[PDB]
Structure 1
Amino acid sequence: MPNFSGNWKIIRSENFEELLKVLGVNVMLRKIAVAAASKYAVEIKQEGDTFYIKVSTTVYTTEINFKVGEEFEEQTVDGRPCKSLVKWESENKMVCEQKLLKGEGPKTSWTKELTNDGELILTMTADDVVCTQVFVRE
């Protein structure tokens, strides 16, 4: 039955560079990151409130495993390790708040949503900056 589960391919990416900028990434690396972001591919397996998510680009791949309501460890977009906790906001929207394991830095979070016309929308936030990325099913 249709939920977040599936193979998703990015179709749009808005404010990605500004987000990296807030996270301290210098301009040459941001431009390379933006170019890599146009091959983002996401594989999701969902069962009840347990998720497996694999995000990959051309040269890199990451997997996360979590259950809504339970703390897990992952990393911020710029690769600093964090403690994360996901909660539902509605039937097909979830929101994750992150806290840095070490150090200080911008407040980051992310949301994912299945829309009514079949898209997966990711938002990623750092302080005041919101990146939106839109995916469709492969």
Structure 2
Amino acid sequence: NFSGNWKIIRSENFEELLKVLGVNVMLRKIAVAAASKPAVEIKQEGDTFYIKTSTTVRTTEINFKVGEEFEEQTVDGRPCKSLVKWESENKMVCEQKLLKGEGPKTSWTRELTNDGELILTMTADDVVCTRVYVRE
């Protein structure tokens, strides 16, 4: 199950994800370094989740239940309305809809492997970033 404190072990394509969302080079470079050793805390109670992710300069906290819309931010920091569903046993998928304006379609997935790794994917249109974590 997803509860725990998680440390990153792999990251692919993060800078490009930000690039396609229009994030400028200075901010991209700052963000990638800032998130290179994040702190991720998850508390799962059935279908209810608390997820806190902290970088060197940012901290985000979401509280949601699978199947119930909630507000969060896109990876580039725009407010959005999100909805998580279970795709399969321990794989949740989230569609995001901007609160204001338009932009590239964004989504994320979080799944647990049999070996206890957490895989996050984040997509912005046709660009996918994958980050893998393990429990502390």
Classify the TM-score, shorter chain: over 0.9
Q: What is the TM-score when the length of structure 2 is the normalising length?
A: 0.97
What whole-Å deviation, never above 9, does each CA across 1:19-44 have from its counterpart, x for those lacking one?
A: 00011111121111111111112100
Q: 1:63 and 1:34 mapped to 2: Cα distance?
A: 19
Q: Where in structure 2 are there 5+ consecutive unaligned residues?
A: none
Deviation at residue 62 of structure 1 after TM alignment: 1.2
Q: 2:121 and 2:2 mapped to 1: Cα distance?
A: 15
Aligned mate of 1:62, from 60, 63, 83: 60
Query: Between Structure 1 and Structure 2, how many residues are aligned?
Result: 136
Q: Is the Cα contact below 8 Å between 2:35 and 2:56 reproduced in 1?
A: no
What whole-Å deviation, never above 9, does each CA across 1:58-113 have from its counterpart, x for those lacking one?
A: 23211100000000000001110001000001111000000000001000000000
Aligned mate of 2:17, from 16, 19, 36: 19
Mapping of 1:38-117 within 5 angstroms? 38-117=36-115
The percent of aligned pairs where both chains have the same amino acid is 96
Deviation at residue 46 of structure 1 after TM alignment: 0.4
Q: What is the TM-score when the length of structure 1 is the normalising length?
A: 0.96
Q: 1:85 and 1:79 mapped to 2: Cα distance?
A: 17
Deviation at residue 12 of structure 1 after TM alignment: 1.2
Structure 1 residue ranges, 4+ long, deviating more than 6 angstroms after superposition: none
